[PDB]
Amino acid sequence: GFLTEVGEARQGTQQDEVIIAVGPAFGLAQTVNIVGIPHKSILREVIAGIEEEGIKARVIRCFKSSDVAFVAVEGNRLSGSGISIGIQSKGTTVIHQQGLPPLSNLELFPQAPLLTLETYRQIGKNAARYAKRESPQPVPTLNDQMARPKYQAKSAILHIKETKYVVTGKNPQELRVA
């Protein structure tokens, strides 16, 4: 357990951070993404990418929904910069922005099996630039026609499992990273 809940997350007050919002099972019932990458390693890279850009990283666990879009939305409501990064246990990631529609985003990574620790790094790096009102080049598109044929069934199973931890009305818990 490299993640500890330290209480209901409060809203940021300055444009100096980026919130990393993870699903209700991240680092708990599930500890690796759809292709085996550990959650500990993933969070490590996202954070290093953000901090590397002179921005603080604050992690929270979301409960009202397991859908990555809404997980991210919970994050952008509390982010001091309005910028957030949503991540499901299986790996799916999105960069959201306070003000945008829930199903709209700045950048989306819809094929988790293709993500690497380096991608997770650039993502944290880009999230920070957005926070600083910079217009960074989007993380290069990663697409593969056989991603679904090989992993969609597995994706559905992993999401079904994480979704069992959804708690309606439960506010986000800020997390202390070991």
């Binding site: 009202k64 929904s65 309606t168 009305g169």
Partner: protein
């Protein structure tokens, strides 16, 4: 009034088709577009046309499709930005019950969109019951 034999309108009764600004199908020519005799504002389907298609849909045995066209007919009077606001207000957790009822009163009083108004009030009632209003997530 209109039936399957009157369809397609463009082929059977083109003169029955006029635009919001009362323009004819023949008025829309490259010449008129270039000289701005006709503009985007002129190119808008009318509530009369949609009600005609509703009658045709009904004659074809498609009652719900016709009802959809009846609603569309009322919505032609509602501005683009207002259409988008109302749609978003109906999405999960966006509105309070009173805001939805206010949209309904507005649709009725300002646009005479009675069917759509009833549609919104119906949603308001069920949204309370199924907890899909602001604050229920």
């Amino acid at each position: 009034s209109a039936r399957v034999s009157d369809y397609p309108l463009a082929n059977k009764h083109p003169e029955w088709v006029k635009t919001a600004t009362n323009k004819t199908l023949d008025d829309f020519t490259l010449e008129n577009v270039l000289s701005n005799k006709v503009t985007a504002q002129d190119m808008r389907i009318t509530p009369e046309t949609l009600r005609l298609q509703a009658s045709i849909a009904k004659d074809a045995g498609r009652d719900r499709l016709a009802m959809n066209f009846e609603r569309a007919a009322e919505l032609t009077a509602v501005p683009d930005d207002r259409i988008l606001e109302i749609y978003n207000a109906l999405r999960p957790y966006r509105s309070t019950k009173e805001e939805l009822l206010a949209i309904a009163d507005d649709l009725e009083s300002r646009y005479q969109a009675k069917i759509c108004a009833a549609f919104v009030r119906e949603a308001a009632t069920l949204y309370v019951e199924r907890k899909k209003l602001k604050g229920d997530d």
